Short mmCIF file of N, CA, C and O in Angstrom, two decimals:
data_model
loop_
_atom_site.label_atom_id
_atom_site.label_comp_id
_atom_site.label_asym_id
_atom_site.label_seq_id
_atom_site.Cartn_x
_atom_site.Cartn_y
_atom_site.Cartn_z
N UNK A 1 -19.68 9.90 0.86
CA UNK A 1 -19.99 8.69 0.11
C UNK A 1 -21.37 8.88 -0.50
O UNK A 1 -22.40 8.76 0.17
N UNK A 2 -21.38 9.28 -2.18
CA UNK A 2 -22.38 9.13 -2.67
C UNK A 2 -22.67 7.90 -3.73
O UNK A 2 -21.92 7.63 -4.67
N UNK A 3 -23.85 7.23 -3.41
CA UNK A 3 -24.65 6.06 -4.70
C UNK A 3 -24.58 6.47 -5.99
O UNK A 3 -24.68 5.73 -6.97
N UNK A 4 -24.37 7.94 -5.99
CA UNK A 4 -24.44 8.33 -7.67
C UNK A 4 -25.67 9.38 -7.75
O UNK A 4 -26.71 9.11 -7.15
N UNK A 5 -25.59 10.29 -8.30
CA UNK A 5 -26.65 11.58 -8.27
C UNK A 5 -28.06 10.92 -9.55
O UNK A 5 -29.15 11.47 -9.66
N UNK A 6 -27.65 9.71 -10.33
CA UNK A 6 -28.41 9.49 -11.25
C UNK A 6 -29.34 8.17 -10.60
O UNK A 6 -30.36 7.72 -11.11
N UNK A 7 -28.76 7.75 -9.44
CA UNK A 7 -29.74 6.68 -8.49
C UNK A 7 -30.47 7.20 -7.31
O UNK A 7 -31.52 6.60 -7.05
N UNK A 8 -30.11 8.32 -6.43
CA UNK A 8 -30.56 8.99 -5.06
C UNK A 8 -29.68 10.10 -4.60
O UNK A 8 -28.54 10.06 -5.06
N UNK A 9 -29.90 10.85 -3.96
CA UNK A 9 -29.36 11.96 -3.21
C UNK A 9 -28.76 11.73 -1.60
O UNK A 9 -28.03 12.43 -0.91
N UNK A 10 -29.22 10.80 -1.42
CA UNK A 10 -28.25 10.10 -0.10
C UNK A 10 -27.24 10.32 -0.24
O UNK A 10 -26.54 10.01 -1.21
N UNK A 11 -26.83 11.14 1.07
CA UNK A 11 -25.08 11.09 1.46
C UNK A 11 -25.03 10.31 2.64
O UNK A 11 -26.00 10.00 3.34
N UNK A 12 -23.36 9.91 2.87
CA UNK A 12 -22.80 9.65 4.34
C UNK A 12 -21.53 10.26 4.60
O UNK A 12 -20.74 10.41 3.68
N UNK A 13 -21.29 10.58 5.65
CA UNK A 13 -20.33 11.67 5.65
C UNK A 13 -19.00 10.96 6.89
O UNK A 13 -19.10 10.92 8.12
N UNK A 14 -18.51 10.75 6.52
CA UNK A 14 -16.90 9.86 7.45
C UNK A 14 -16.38 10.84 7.72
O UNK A 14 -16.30 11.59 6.75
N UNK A 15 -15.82 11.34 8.91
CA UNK A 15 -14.95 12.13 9.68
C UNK A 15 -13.46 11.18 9.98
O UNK A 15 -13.22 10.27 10.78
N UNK A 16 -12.95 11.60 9.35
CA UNK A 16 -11.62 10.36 9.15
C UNK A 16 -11.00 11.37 10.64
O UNK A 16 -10.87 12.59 10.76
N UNK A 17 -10.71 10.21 11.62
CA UNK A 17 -9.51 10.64 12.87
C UNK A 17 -10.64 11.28 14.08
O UNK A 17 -10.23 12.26 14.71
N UNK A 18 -12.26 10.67 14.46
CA UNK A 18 -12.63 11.05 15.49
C UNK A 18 -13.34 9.88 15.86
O UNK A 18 -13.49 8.82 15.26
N UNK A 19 -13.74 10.25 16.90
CA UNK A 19 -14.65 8.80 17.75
C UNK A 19 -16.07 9.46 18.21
O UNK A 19 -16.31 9.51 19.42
N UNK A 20 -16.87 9.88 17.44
CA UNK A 20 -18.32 9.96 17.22
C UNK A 20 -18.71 10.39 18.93
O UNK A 20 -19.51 9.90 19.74
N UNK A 21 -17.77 11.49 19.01
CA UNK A 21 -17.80 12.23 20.38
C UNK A 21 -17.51 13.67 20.51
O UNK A 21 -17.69 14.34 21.53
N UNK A 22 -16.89 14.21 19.00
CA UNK A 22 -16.93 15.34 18.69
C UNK A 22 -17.05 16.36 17.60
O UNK A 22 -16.47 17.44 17.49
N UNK A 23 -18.04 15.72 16.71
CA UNK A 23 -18.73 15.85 15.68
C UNK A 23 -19.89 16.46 15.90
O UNK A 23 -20.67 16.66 14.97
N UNK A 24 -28.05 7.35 11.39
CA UNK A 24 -27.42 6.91 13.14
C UNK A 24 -26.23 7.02 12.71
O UNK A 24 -25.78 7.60 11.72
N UNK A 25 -25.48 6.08 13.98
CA UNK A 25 -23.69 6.93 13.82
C UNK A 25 -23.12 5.48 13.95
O UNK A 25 -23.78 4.56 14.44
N UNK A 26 -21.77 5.32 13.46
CA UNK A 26 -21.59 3.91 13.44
C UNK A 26 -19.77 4.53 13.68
O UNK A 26 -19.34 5.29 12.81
N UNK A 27 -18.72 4.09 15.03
CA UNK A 27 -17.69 4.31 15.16
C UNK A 27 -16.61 2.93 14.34
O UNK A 27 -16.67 1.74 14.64
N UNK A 28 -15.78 3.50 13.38
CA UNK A 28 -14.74 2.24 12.88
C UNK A 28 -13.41 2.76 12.96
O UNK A 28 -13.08 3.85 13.42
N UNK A 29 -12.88 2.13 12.61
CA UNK A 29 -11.48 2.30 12.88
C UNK A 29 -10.76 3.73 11.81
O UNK A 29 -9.57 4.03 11.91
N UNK B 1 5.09 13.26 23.17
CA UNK B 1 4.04 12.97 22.43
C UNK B 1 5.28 11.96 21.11
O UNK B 1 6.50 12.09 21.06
N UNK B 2 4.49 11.11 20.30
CA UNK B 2 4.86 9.84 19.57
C UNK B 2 5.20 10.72 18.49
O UNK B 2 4.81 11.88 18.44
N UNK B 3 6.05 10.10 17.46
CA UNK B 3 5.71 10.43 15.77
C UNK B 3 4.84 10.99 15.64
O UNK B 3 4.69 12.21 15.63
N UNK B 4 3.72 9.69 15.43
CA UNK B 4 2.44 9.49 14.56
C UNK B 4 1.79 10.74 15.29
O UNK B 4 1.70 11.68 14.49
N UNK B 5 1.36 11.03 16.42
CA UNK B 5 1.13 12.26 17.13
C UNK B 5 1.13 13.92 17.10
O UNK B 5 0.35 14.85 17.33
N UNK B 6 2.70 13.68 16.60
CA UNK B 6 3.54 14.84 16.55
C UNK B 6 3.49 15.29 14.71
O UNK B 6 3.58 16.42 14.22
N UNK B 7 3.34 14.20 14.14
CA UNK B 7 3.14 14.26 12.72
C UNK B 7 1.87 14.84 11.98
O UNK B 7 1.77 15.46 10.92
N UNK B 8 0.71 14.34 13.10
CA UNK B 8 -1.09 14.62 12.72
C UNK B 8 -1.38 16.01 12.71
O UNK B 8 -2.11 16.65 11.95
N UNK B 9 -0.60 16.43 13.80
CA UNK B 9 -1.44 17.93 14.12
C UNK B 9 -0.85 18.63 12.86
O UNK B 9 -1.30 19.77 12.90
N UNK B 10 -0.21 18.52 11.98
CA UNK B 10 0.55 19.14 10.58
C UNK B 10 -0.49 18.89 9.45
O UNK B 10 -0.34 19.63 8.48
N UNK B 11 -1.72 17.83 9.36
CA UNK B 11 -1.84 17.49 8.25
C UNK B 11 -1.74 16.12 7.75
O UNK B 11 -2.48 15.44 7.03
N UNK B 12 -0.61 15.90 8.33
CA UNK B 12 -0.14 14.33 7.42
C UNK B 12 -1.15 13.62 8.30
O UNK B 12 -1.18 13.88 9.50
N UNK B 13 -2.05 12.66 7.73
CA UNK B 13 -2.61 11.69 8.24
C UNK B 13 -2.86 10.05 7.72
O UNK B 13 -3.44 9.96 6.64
N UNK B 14 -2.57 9.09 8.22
CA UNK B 14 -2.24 7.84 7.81
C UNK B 14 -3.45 7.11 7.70
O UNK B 14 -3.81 6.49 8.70
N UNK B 15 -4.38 7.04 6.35
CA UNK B 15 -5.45 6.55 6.21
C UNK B 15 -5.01 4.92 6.83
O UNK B 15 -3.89 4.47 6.57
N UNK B 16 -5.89 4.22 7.55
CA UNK B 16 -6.03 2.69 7.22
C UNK B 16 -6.27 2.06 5.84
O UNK B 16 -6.77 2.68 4.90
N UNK B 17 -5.87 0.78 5.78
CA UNK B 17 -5.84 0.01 4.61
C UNK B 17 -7.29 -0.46 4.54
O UNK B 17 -8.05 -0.55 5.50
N UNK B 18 -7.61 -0.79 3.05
CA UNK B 18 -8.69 -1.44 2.93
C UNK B 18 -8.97 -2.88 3.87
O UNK B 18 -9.52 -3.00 4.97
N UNK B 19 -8.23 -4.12 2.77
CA UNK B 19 -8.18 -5.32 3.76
C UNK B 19 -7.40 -5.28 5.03
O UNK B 19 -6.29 -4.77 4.92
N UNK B 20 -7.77 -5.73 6.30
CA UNK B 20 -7.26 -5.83 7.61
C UNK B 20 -5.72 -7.07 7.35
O UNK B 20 -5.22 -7.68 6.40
N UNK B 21 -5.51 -6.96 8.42
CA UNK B 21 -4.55 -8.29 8.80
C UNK B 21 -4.90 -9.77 8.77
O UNK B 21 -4.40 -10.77 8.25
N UNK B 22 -6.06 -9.46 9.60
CA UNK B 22 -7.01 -10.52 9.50
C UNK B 22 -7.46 -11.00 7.67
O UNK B 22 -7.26 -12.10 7.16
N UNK B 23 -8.04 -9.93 7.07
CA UNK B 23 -8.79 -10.78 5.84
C UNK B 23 -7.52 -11.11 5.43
O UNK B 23 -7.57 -12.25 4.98
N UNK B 24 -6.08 -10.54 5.34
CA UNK B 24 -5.11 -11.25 4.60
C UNK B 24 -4.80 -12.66 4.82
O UNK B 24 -4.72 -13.62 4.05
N UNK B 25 -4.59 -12.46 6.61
CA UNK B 25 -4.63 -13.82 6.64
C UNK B 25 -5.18 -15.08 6.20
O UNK B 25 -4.70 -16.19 5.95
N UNK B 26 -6.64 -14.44 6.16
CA UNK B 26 -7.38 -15.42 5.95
C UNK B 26 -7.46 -15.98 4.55
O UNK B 26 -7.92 -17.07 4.20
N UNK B 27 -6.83 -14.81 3.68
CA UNK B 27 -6.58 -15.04 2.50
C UNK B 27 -5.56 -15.77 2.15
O UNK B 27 -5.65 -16.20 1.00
N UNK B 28 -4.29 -16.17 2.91
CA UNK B 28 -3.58 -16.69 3.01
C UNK B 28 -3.61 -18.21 3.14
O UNK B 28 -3.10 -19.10 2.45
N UNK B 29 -4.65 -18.22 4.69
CA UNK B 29 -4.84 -19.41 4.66
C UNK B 29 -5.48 -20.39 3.70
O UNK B 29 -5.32 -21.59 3.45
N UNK B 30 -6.21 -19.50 3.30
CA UNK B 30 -7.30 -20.09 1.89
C UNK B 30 -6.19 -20.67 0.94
O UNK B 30 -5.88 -21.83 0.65
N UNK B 31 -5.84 -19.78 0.68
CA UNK B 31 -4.66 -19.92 -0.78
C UNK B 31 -3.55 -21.31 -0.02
O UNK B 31 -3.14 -21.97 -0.97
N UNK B 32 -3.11 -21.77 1.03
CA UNK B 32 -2.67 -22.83 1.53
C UNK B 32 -3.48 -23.85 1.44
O UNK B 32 -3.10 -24.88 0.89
N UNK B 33 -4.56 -23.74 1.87
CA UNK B 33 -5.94 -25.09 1.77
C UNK B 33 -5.85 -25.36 0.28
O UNK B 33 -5.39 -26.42 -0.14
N UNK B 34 -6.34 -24.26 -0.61
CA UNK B 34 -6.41 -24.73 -1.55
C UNK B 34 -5.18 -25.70 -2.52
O UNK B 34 -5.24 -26.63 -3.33
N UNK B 35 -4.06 -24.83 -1.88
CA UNK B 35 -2.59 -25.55 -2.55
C UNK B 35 -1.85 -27.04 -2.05
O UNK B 35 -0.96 -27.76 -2.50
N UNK B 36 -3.04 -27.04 -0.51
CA UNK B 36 -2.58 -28.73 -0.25
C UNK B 36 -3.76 -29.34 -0.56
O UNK B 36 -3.46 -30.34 -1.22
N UNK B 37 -4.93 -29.26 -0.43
CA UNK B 37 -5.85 -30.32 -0.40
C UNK B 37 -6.09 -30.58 -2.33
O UNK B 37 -6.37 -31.64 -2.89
N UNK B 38 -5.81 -28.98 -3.06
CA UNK B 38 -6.13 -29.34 -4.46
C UNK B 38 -5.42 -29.11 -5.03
O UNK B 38 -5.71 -29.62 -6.12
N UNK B 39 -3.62 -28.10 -5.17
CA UNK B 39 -2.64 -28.34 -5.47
C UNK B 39 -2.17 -27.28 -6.42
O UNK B 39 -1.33 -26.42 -6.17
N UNK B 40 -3.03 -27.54 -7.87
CA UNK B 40 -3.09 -26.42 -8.98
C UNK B 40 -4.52 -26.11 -9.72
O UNK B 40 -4.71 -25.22 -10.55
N UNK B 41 -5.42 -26.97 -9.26
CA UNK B 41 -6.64 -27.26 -10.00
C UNK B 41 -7.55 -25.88 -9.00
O UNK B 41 -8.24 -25.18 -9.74
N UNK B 42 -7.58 -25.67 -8.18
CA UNK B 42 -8.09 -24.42 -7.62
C UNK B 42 -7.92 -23.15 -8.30
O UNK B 42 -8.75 -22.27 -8.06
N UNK B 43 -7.00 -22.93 -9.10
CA UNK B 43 -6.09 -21.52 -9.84
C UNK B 43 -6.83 -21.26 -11.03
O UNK B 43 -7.18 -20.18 -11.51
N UNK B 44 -7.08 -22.94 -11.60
CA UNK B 44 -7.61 -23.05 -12.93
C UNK B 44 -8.91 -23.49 -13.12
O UNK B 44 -9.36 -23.70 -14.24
N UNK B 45 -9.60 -23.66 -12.00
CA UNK B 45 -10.71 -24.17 -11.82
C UNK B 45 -11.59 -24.01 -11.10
O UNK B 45 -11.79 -22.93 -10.55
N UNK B 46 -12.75 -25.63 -10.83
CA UNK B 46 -12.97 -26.14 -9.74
C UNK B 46 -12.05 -27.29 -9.08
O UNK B 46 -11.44 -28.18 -9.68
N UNK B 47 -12.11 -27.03 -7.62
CA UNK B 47 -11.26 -27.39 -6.51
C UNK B 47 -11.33 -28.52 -6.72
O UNK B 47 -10.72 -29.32 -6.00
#
């Protein structure tokens, strides 16, 4: 998930199908 | 082991939906409030 390369360089990165146990960190469905 | 189980380890994986059950509902219920307390004037308007 990027804002757009022409607003910031911030990424976030979703691991679709784990529970933030085998990869701050935020667990969703 | 299930389907959904037996299906994952291949690849196929079943994203979740955007809106939940819940916001539908709730969208639902809205769209009822609005259709008894204001009828048609909510669709086209203010309530």
């Amino acid at each position: 998930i990027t804002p757009g390369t022409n607003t910031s360089n911030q990424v976030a990165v979703l691991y679709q199908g784990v529970n933030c146990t085998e990869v701050n960190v935020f667990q969703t469905r | 082991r299930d389907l959904i189980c037996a299906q994952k380890f291949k690849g196929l994986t079943v994203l979740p939906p955007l809106l939940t059950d819940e916001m539908i509902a709730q969208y639902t219920s809205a769209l009822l409030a609005g259709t008894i307390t204001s009828g048609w004037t909510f669709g086209a308007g203010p309530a």
